[PDB]
Structure formats: structure tokens, C-alpha cells
Design brief:
Blueprint: H1 4-13, H2 17-24, H3 29-32, H4 35-47, H5 51-58, H6 68-83, H7 87-98, H8 103-115, H9 119-130, H10 140-152, H11 157-169
Helix pairs in contact: 1-2, 2-4, 4-5, 4-6, 5-6, 7-8, 8-9, 8-10, 9-10, 9-11, 10-11
């Protein structure tokens, strides 16, 4: 645990959130729940755009740890989550509902979803086209699905569920 903790420390210094989250999940459960390790893990979730996991973790930080760093993380989550309901997103959404077959709008909606951490919806949007037609849009739908996954990373549980999804239906 002792050195591992400096591994986390070292990894955060360097912006390796996803490695850092990996080392975290290897600590004891006791050390995992230490309030400073929680903040660390919260910062990692947020830098990796897992805002829902971040918010639900942040909601268990006890008072004695409601730090300067915790405050700034609250404020970050609140700014991110406002940015996820834009008029822009709204319009593309109403527009895709009325043009459900326009695959090229779906790719753009998805890329905008992704830009604000609405990645579950981004990938579910695309997934719904791909499991009917892997070629959808001259393979432009599979690709934007694929850039979203790789953008996300290997630790990401949403990325991992859709990777498995897509893989299971490859010819």
C-alpha cells in the first residue's frame, strides 16, 4: 500500500489518471475508502470524463475532507454538467428525432455528445444503428463509434461495455 500510494501520487503528477485509477483499485478496501484516496479517485474520474461515477463518489466525501480540492471538484462537476445541456444539443436532438434515418446527423450528434461527456448516449445512439447495419453511412458510423471508444480509454466502464457489444456482432 505504502509505495502503491506513491505510484498513485507519481501517476497523478504526470496526468496519468487512468493508470492512477488502476493502481487505486488495487489498494486495500480500507485504503480505498480513505478520504484523501477518494479525492484522488474523484479527480481521476472527472479527468477521464466519467462524471456520474465522479459525482456519486464525491457524495461520500465526509466533512473533515471537504477540502479546497474537494470544493474545486464540486465546482468542476457542476460546470461540466451545465455544459451537457446546451441549446445546441437540444436542436440536434429534435432534429435527429424528425430525421431518424439521417446517419450523418447521428455521427455529429454523437461527436457533440462525446464533447460534453455524454458518452453513454453517444455510443448508444451509434450502437442502435450498427446492430442493424455495421456499414451504416459508408462505415462512418462504426468509425465514429470507434474514435469515441479509443478517445475514452481502457479503464472506462462505458467504453468497455460498448467495445464488448461491438465485438460480439463483428462478422
Amino acid at each position: 500500500d505504502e509505495q502503491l500510494l506513491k505510484q498513485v501520487s507519481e501517476l497523478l503528477q504526470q496526468g496519468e489518471h487512468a493508470q492512477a485509477l488502476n493502481v487505486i483499485q488495487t489498494l486495500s478496501d480500507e485504503l480505498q475508502s480513505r478520504g484523501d484516496v477518494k479525492l484522488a479517485k474523484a479527480d481521476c474520474l472527472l479527468e477521464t470524463k466519467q462524471f456520474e461515477l465522479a459525482q456519486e463518489l464525491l457524495a461520500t466525501i465526509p466533512l473533515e475532507y471537504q477540502d479546497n480540492s474537494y470544493k474545486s471538484l464540486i465546482a468542476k462537476l457542476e460546470l461540466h454538467q451545465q455544459a451537457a445541456e446546451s441549446p445546441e444539443l437540444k436542436r440536434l436532438e429534435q432534429e435527429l428525432a424528425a430525421n431518424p434515418d439521417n446517419f450523418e446527423l447521428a455521427c455529429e450528434l454523437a461527436v457533440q455528445y462525446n464533447q460534453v461527456g455524454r458518452d453513454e448516449e453517444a455510443l448508444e445512439l451509434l450502437w442502435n444503428i450498427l446492430k442493424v447495419n455495421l456499414g451504416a453511412q459508408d462505415g462512418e458510423v462504426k468509425k465514429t463509434f470507434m474514435d469515441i471508444l479509443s478517445a475514452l480509454g481502457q479503464g472506462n466502464a462505458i467504453a468497455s461495455k460498448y467495445r464488448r457489444q461491438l465485438y460480439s456482432i463483428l462478422y
